[PDB]
Amino acid sequence: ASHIVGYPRMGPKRELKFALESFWDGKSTAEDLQKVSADLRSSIWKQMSAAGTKFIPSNTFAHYDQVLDTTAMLGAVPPRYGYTGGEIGLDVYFSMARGNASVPAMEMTKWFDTNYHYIVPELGPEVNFSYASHKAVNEYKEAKALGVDTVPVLVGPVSYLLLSKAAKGVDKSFELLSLLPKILPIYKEVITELKAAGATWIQLDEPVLVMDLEGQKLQAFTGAYAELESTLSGLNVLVETYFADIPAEAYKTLTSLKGVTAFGFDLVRGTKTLDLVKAGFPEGKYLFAGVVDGRNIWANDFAASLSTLQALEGIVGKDKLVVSTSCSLLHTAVDLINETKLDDEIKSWMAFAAQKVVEVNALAKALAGQKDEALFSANAAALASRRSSPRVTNEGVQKAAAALKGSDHRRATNVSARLDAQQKKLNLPILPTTTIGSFPQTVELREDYVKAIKEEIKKVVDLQEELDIDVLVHGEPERNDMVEYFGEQLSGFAFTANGWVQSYGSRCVKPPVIYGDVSRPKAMTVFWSAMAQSMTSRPMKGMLTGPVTILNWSFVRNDQPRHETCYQIALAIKDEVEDLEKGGIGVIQIDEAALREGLPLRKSEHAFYLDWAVHSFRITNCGVQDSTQIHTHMCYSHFNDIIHSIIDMDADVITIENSRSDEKLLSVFREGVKYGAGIGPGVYDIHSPRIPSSEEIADRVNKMLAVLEQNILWVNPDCGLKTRKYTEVKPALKNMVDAAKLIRSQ
Ligand SMILES: [Zn+2]
Ligand SMILES: [Zn+2]
């Protein structure tokens, strides 16, 4: 009775990532891939079953995205790609996914609240669905032809649409959920083909049920499962859900659904859902206790599990209890056993995909007999050491009794009271010019001062000679990733070697690991900033990476709250800001692009996030002279519904991912607001190699002089500049203060 909701699809060494690019660029027959893909599938099925894995998912693979695999199942393939019909393949899957030369790909978004991205279905009243992608059914026969019988994981009809989006044209008054009966048969055709394939169980992921559907939307679910009951005759169905706890209503509608004989809840992030089952439950259905994190990287507290996993036996037990992972072990890493650089003591404190597969099986076993007491002894030990090893609990739990000690608004001063100061002790003209954060390279190698400043100084002599430029920027050369960097300079901050995660396409990321109560005993920036602000006579702004962002983009421990760790990571910051303070530097820019990314799916749960999230940003400079001028960064174009928190951060100047949105919607910083401060909406989108006309920025800004103010304005880019080339970046900025100097004439 062991189930695993999903699994990674790139390799224990990122194979698919490369077999994709080999292919992608024209360096391998479309068979090299398949010889590859198949060589992976074969391993996972095999490696999963060999462990005792009961339900082994089939169709969790994907050359690109689960949601696209679905879009291909119904032949929803867009119109700009030119699809006539037939069994889709490569040319059209990636065409849509990556965009070919002549016509662009399809917009991508987040897989709920995870750091993965999916391909948003582009639907409407004119798309003609077609059963044009037998991936599902094929991979089943494959694995089967390999000795193992698998479970056909699939995306839920309704959920598919909910997550879908109606592309251009379609009148606004359209019901994106009206396609239900048009797509519901193409769903049938599948079912029956697999039914007749040899399948005994099947899986339907419907995570949206863990969102907030109003009474009307919920229904959608029913009207669609009462249409399948016929097709699902004498065949168990397992509807999946994850990343949250399901609301009474949603819980009801679900546990009552027609045709479904088993349900699975992410009981790691939704342990409230239990209370609704304790209260009421269906007949003798199946319960897939999803207690094995497929989100983080630590060995599931066996003891606990087995205790709760037991508690459930009480709700059922008549043989319908099944151990399962919480979410998909796709969102985690792969095989922990590709880690050595990490001292053993710690790998004992982890477990990645591969490890998790087993995890499910030892609790699977131990809850039925054969219990390798050699795991729980080893387990409770893995535990033992963590909740004790002085590497964990530190005298860093120092600045806490001094934390609950009131918030930390910046030394009062109704900003416009300090702004005056930040003028005398820092001059400047109207609309002071500046940039965003990083810059391009040259040859590069991978002493270090004879080659260090070498460029740090050219950036200097270039940022100066360049149309003057009131305020300047250093250029983060002495780093790698704004996050990767600061890491190895804080306490509970270890790093991994092979533990990778996907973030769309071949693209993958290796988020740092937070172990013990974080802390920066030693200085981290200082001279690197005083390096430049010693050469120039113009405002040199520092460079910090908010405690919000940092925290988010990383595997954060499971022994205490997100905020608690979060804040500590904010304390160390105040150490640095206060250093560019005493270190001289008058201006210190701080960024929090990864601000929104923490929003808890359950809306009523939001307000709290924005709590410790923003308070924390303040807990960075709540000890700064009324002369120091801090700027902040947020990579959002339309944060209209999160203006408050943005106004509560209390900053003298900021920046955002403006440039490609509205100049009239900017009048959102006043009506019922009135920010009274400085804002630098990136008038010019850096993410584009194509330089804009200097005749497009004067007005862009002249549309800001209207909806915004002129006695408080700034000049800068959309986002950072660590991708743009070099001949497309020089004849570029050489046209930014220009469109400003103008209007000043009066
Ligand atoms: Zn407030
Ligand atoms: Zn940016």
Side-chain angles (χ1 to χ4, degrees):
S2 76
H3 164 255
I4 302 174
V5 339
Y7 206 78
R9 72 262 202 158
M10 225 147 260
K13 300 286 180 176
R14 324 232 292 298
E15 293 75 316
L16 167 60
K17 179 189 179 304
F18 306 107
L20 275 164
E21 311 196 3
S22 172
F23 182 87
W24 266 326
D25 309 296
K27 305 169 301 184
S28 44
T29 64
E31 297 200 295
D32 310 27
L33 261 186
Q34 302 293 193
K35 181 52 194 171
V36 186
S37 288
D39 275 47
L40 283 197
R41 287 193 274 272
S42 50
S43 160
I44 300 311
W45 288 320
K46 279 164 177 170
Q47 173 237 283
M48 282 205 261
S49 45
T53 304
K54 183 83 281 306
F55 310 96
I56 305 169
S58 80
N59 200 44
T60 45
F61 179 86
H63 289 89
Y64 219 66
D65 168 67
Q66 62 243 62
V67 196
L68 216 199
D69 301 312
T70 322
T71 318
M73 196 195 299
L74 331 178
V77 49
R80 60 180 178 293
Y81 298 107
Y83 175 69
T84 71
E87 200 50 33
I88 308 185
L90 305 170
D91 263 300
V92 179
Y93 185 64
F94 298 139
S95 56
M96 297 183 289
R98 57 138 40 183
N100 48 204
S102 52
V103 170
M106 302 198 282
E107 196 200 67
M108 62 174 101
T109 192
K110 250 94 307 77
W111 183 232
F112 284 65
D113 69 335
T114 36
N115 302 286
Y116 165 75
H117 302 43
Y118 85 74
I119 284 298
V120 233
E122 314 183 67
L123 295 165
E126 217 91 49
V127 60
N128 198 54
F129 305 101
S130 154
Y131 187 166
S133 204
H134 302 66
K135 179 170 187 297
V137 60
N138 298 324
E139 278 182 65
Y140 170 67
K141 286 173 147 298
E142 197 175 296
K144 181 54 167 296
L146 283 59
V148 61
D149 172 15
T150 61
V151 165
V153 175
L154 278 185
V155 185
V158 47
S159 259
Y160 172 84
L161 304 87
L162 299 179
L163 283 166
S164 304
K165 314 297 182 63
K168 38 194 299 67
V170 184
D171 65 307
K172 48 177 171 297
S173 308
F174 171 58
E175 244 294 61
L176 279 144
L177 198 69
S178 51
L179 319 183
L180 265 204
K182 186 172 296 185
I183 52 189
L184 238 59
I186 294 183
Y187 260 87
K188 290 169 177 183
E189 321 291 295
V190 195
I191 313 296
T192 61
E193 273 204 305
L194 306 91
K195 235 211 309 172
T200 110
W201 267 70
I202 176 187
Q203 183 174 301
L204 262 175
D205 292 27
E206 294 271 24
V208 194
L209 287 178
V210 315
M211 296 288 96
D212 287 303
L213 293 311
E214 73 154 5
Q216 276 64 204
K217 287 172 169 181
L218 274 184
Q219 185 76 159
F221 281 88
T222 327
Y225 284 69
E227 160 105 270
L228 286 35
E229 177 152 58
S230 174
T231 309
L232 289 309
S233 295
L235 164 58
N236 298 286
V237 199
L238 169 284
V239 258
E240 277 304 318
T241 64
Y242 42 60
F243 308 154
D245 84 304
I246 317 75
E249 278 303 299
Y251 168 73
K252 180 182 183 175
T253 293
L254 179 263
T255 64
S256 39
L257 284 169
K258 306 292 177 307
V260 185
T261 57
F263 316 78
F265 324 118
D266 181 315
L267 297 183
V268 174
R269 312 196 78 185
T271 42
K272 294 195 59 293
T273 314
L274 290 77
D275 311 315
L276 301 169
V277 168
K278 292 201 166 181
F281 185 69
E283 321 281 66
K285 296 305 168 196
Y286 281 97
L287 212 205
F288 287 60
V291 282
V292 178
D293 213 341
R295 248 172 171 287
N296 249 296
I297 212 77
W298 327 102
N300 166 277
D301 186 46
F302 285 60
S305 287
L306 240 182
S307 176
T308 314
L309 258 169
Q310 268 171 175
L312 309 185
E313 311 315 67
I315 314 309
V316 210
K318 296 173 302 307
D319 294 339
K320 289 206 175 181
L321 187 294
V322 176
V323 193
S324 167
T325 61
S326 69
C327 58
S328 182
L329 304 188
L330 160 284
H331 290 301
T332 188
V334 172
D335 206 322
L336 167 149
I337 206 55
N338 287 193
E339 294 293 286
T340 176
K341 317 310 177 297
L342 291 182
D343 68 306
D344 299 290
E345 179 209 54
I346 233 55
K347 339 201 217 125
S348 63
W349 294 8
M350 303 174 88
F352 303 34
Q355 289 55 53
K356 301 174 180 316
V357 172
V358 194
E359 295 253 304
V360 172
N361 285 297
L363 279 184
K365 288 304 204 71
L367 246 168
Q370 283 74 59
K371 171 188 180 179
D372 187 61
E373 186 87 48
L375 303 179
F376 297 65
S377 299
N379 173 231
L383 305 180
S385 28
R386 187 168 165 183
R387 334 170 182 183
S388 60
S389 168
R391 294 190 80 187
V392 193
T393 52
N394 176 286
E395 288 311 314
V397 175
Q398 208 283 181
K399 302 299 192 302
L404 313 335
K405 182 207 62 190
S407 62
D408 300 72
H409 289 79
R410 179 174 165 184
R411 285 288 159 292
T413 321
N414 176 185
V415 71
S416 70
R418 160 184 59 273
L419 300 180
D420 305 327
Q422 300 164 297
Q423 247 299 320
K424 155 186 154 298
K425 223 80 169 176
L426 306 159
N427 182 63
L428 291 166
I430 316 175
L431 282 59
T433 35
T434 185
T435 356
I436 300 295
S438 62
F439 273 78
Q441 315 184 319
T442 314
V443 187
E444 307 326 84
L445 303 302
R446 303 182 65 193
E447 270 295 304
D448 288 359
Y449 275 62
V450 52
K451 320 300 180 180
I453 318 177
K454 200 160 186 176
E455 195 68 300
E456 300 177 0
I457 172 57
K458 303 184 186 71
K459 301 184 176 182
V460 168
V461 187
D462 167 299
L463 218 178
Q464 287 194 298
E465 69 177 60
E466 189 58 15
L467 58 69
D468 304 59
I469 307 183
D470 322 292
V471 183
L472 307 210
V473 300
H474 95 297
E476 298 170 67
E478 18 67 47
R479 301 169 183 190
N480 198 295
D481 183 54
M482 33 161 67
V483 188
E484 292 285 70
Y485 178 49
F486 307 110
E488 69 286 353
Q489 301 185 71
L490 305 169
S491 292
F493 231 87
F495 297 73
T496 274
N498 280 317
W500 280 80
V501 188
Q502 173 180 34
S503 293
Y504 98 77
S506 59
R507 232 35 293 189
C508 291
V509 310
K510 201 214 291 184
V513 182
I514 290 74
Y515 57 87
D517 311 61
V518 195
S519 160
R520 63 153 291 298
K522 284 189 174 182
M524 304 169 10
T525 295
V526 185
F527 79 89
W528 274 150
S529 293
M531 199 86 256
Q533 174 65 177
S534 64
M535 325 180 90
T536 172
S537 58
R538 300 165 183 292
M540 245 295 279
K541 56 170 68 181
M543 256 306 301
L544 305 180
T545 290
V548 178
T549 286
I550 296 176
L551 186 67
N552 284 353
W553 302 341
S554 278
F555 287 112
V556 182
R557 61 178 166 180
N558 59 323
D559 44 317
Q560 68 151 58
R562 312 185 299 168
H563 48 271
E564 212 177 295
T565 290
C566 173
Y567 278 143
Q568 324 184 319
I569 298 175
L571 280 285
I573 316 298
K574 198 159 170 295
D575 266 291
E576 285 300 304
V577 240
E578 295 167 311
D579 282 341
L580 295 93
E581 164 92 60
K582 303 195 69 181
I585 303 68
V587 191
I588 306 170
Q589 163 185 291
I590 292 176
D591 26 61
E592 285 302 49
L595 160 80
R596 201 182 304 227
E597 300 57 280
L599 294 180
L601 319 172
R602 187 82 324 108
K603 288 168 287 78
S604 92
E605 266 195 52
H606 284 201
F608 189 164
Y609 174 68
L610 311 166
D611 203 52
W612 57 273
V614 185
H615 174 178
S616 180
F617 177 64
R618 295 193 278 74
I619 305 184
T620 288
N621 56 25
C622 78
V624 67
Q625 293 301 169
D626 297 47
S627 52
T628 299
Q629 201 179 73
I630 309 75
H631 300 198
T632 197
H633 171 70
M634 302 148 313
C635 297
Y636 317 136
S637 57
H638 259 155
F639 36 45
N640 280 49
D641 59 311
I642 185 186
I643 169 183
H644 183 52
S645 46
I646 281 193
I647 214 172
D648 283 307
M649 300 187 86
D650 191 295
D652 315 309
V653 158
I654 64 184
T655 190
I656 57 288
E657 192 169 306
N658 188 274
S659 162
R660 311 291 202 187
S661 283
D662 309 306
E663 53 200 2
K664 289 186 174 180
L665 263 171
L666 282 169
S667 74
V668 292
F669 306 104
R670 232 202 65 56
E671 175 182 345
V673 184
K674 306 195 294 185
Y675 188 56
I679 173 185
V683 274
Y684 122 61
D685 176 62
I686 54 87
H687 303 299
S688 63
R690 80 98 168 183
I691 66 289
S693 312
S694 186
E695 24 114 351
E696 307 183 66
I697 300 175
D699 193 60
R700 264 298 297 167
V701 178
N702 278 305
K703 287 297 190 300
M704 274 179 64
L705 327 186
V707 292
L708 324 176
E709 196 76 305
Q710 188 175 299
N711 93 296
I712 31 185
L713 198 49
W714 284 77
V715 188
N716 54 296
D718 181 329
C719 286
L721 269 152
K722 216 290 183 60
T723 53
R724 208 85 291 86
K725 194 205 169 302
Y726 248 120
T727 65
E728 50 184 50
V729 304
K730 288 305 169 59
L733 284 168
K734 190 167 290 74
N735 292 266
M736 193 172 80
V737 80
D738 312 288
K741 305 189 60 178
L742 275 52
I743 2 288
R744 168 179 304 195
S745 302
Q746 292 54 225

